[PDB]
A paper describes a structure:
Rab proteins, the biggest subfamily within the superfamily of small GTPases, are major regulators of vesicular trafficking in eukaryotic cells. One such family of effector proteins that was reported to link Rab proteins and the cytoskeleton is the Mical (molecules interacting with CasL) family. In this publication, we present a thorough biochemical and structural analysis of a Rab effector domain termed bivalent Mical/EHBP Rab binding (bMERB) domain. The results show that the domains probably constitute a Rab8-effector family involved in endosomal trafficking, and the Rab-binding specificity can be well explained from the 3-dimensional structures of complexes determined in this work.
Well diffracting crystals were found using the RBD of Mical-cL (residues 534–683) in complex with different Rab proteins (Rab1, Rab8 and Rab10). In all structures (Rab1:Mical-cL, Rab8:Mical-cL and Rab10:Mical-cL) we found one Rab protein bound to one molecule of Mical-cL, in agreement with the previous observations that all Rab proteins tested bind only one site in Mical-cL. Most interactions were visible between the Rab proteins and α-helix 3 of Mical-cL with some additional contributing residues from α-helix 2, forming extensive contacts involving residues within switch I and II of the Rab proteins. In the Rab:Mical-cL structures, we observed extensive interaction of Mical-cL with RabSF1 (Tyr6, Asp7, Leu9, Lys11 in Rab10) and (less interactions) with RabSF2 (Asp31, Ser40 in Rab10). Accordingly, the sequence alignment of different Rab proteins shows strong conservation of the interacting amino acids within these motifs amongst Rab1 (Rab1a/b, Rab35) and Rab8 (Rab8a/b, Rab10, Rab13, Rab15) family members that interact with bMERB domains, but not for other Rab proteins (a comparative scheme of the residues involved in interactions in the different complexes is shown in Figure 5—figure supplement 1a). Interestingly, whereas Rab1 contains a glutamate near the N-terminus (Glu4), all Rab8 family members contain one or (in the case of Rab10) two lysine residues in this region that point towards a negatively charged patch in Mical-cL. In contrast to the main interacting helix α3, which adopts a similar position in all three structures, we observed slightly different orientations of the α-helices 1 and 2, adopting a position slightly further away from Rab1 compared to Rab8 and Rab10. (b) In all structures of Rab proteins in complex with Mical-cL, the N-termini of the Rab proteins point towards a negatively charged patch of Mical-cL (Rabs are shown in cartoon representation as above; the surface of Mical-cL is colored by charge, red – negative charge, blue – positive charge). The sequence of the N-terminal residues of each Rab protein is shown below the corresponding structure: Whereas Rab1 contains a negatively charged glutamate at position 4, Rab8 and Rab10 contain one or two lysine residues at position 3 or at position 3 and 4, respectively.
Author numbering:
A (entry chain B): 531 to 573, 582 to 683
B (entry chain A): 1 to 175
């Protein structure tokens, strides 16, 4: 059937993340090529060297965002898997208790199990972003001490 | 790059009887919309909402709880990690309000000592079906020294304000 609204919203997020990602990658390149151009020039030198500092800090920012974007794409796929599991669970759930076989109860339980797992997986990605954040705040403090 | 990054992560929890509107309250805060079909929560779920307070971005990880007592044992697992907790009852349902005392002692039993509690009287848009007086909502909130809001997921009343106030409460207590 035709695509539902909630799936369409998830779709545009994923596509938007990929566009942002591609902008990061090309920026990462444009800075790489420019980086070789400053290195060759040295071989006002003094300030020439901290427009290269400004670059290094920006190149750092790009890596931080790239890491976030990659994780963001993983979250959406888990959210996609979660909806499918959730709908598969409610179909089994609604059927009359009178007509439920042990098989019907078991498979109803294994989907619920599988459902709670992707939610735990989603929570791990949330923590992963936090652990990166604390590392980069630590770096930032030292970098600007 | 124009898209910035969050500066702090807060973990919230929504508790209350089945049908008080916990999910709808969150969905209004997340997607600014409201659906009338009752789709009861299974196990536990959470949503992400990042909001800006005191000049510093704050990422809210808001866990949504299944009200049905068959999942109650699951929810108890998540009290300990919560930094802020929403107690949601229905002003059109008297039974959901008397169970507030029971929910509160599930909080003090499991959750951390410094946890921020807040009482939400949802469905305040239904005047013709109101059973719980607003004054009674503030009374018992005052006896526990917590904050209280009469909210409406349908009419978008005190929802943005509710979540933001709970976060600013948490932010002030971290030093
Ligand atoms: N008029 C009105 N109806 C509301 C409001 N909030 C929720 N509802 C309705 O009340 C019912 C219960 O909402 P829901 O959020 O699913 O309840 P819940 O707290 O999530 N229950 P559960 O714990 O089972 O998931 C739904 O039919 C929903 O449309 C509100 O502010 N106003
Ligand atoms: Mg719910």
């Amino acid at each position: 059937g035709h695509m539902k609204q909630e799936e369409l919203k998830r779709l545009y997020k994923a596509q938007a993340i990929q566009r942002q990602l591609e902008e990061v990658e090309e920026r990462q390149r444009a800075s790489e090529i420019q980086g070789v151009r400053l290195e060759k020039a040295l071989r006002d030198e003094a300030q020439l060297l901290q427009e290269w500092f400004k670059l290094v800090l920006e190149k750092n920012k790009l890596m931080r965002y790239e890491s976030e974007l990659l994780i963001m794409a993983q979250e959406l796929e888990l959210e996609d898997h979660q909806s499918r599991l959730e709908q598969k669970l409610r179909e089994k759930m609604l059927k009359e208790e009178s007509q439920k076989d042990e098989k019907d109860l078991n498979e109803e339980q294994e989907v619920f199990t599988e459902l709670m797992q992707v939610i735990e997986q989603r929570d791990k990605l949330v923590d992963s972003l936090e652990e990166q954040r604390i590392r980069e705040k630590a770096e930032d403090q030292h970098f600007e001490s | 790059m124009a898209k910035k990054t969050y500066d702090l992560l807060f973990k919230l929890l929504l508790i209350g009887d089945s049908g008080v509107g916990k999910t709808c309250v969150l969905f209004r805060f997340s997607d600014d919309a409201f659906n009338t079909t009752f789709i009861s929560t299974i196990g536990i779920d959470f949503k992400i909402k990042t909001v800006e307070l005191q000049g510093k971005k704050i990422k809210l990880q808001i866990w949504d709880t299944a009200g049905q007592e068959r999942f109650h044992t699951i929810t108890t697992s998540y009290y300990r990690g919560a930094m802020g907790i929403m107690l949601v009852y229905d002003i059109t349902n008297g039974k959901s309000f008397e169970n507030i005392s029971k929910w509160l002692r599930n909080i003090d039993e499991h959750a951390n000592e410094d946890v921020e509690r807040m009482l939400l009287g949802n469905k305040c848009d239904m005047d013709d079906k109101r059973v719980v007086p607003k004054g009674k909502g503030e009374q018992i909130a005052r006896e526990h020294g917590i904050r209280f809001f009469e909210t409406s997921a349908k009419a978008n009343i005190n929802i943005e304000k509710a979540f933001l106030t709970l976060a600013e409460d948490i932010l002030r207590k971290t030093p």
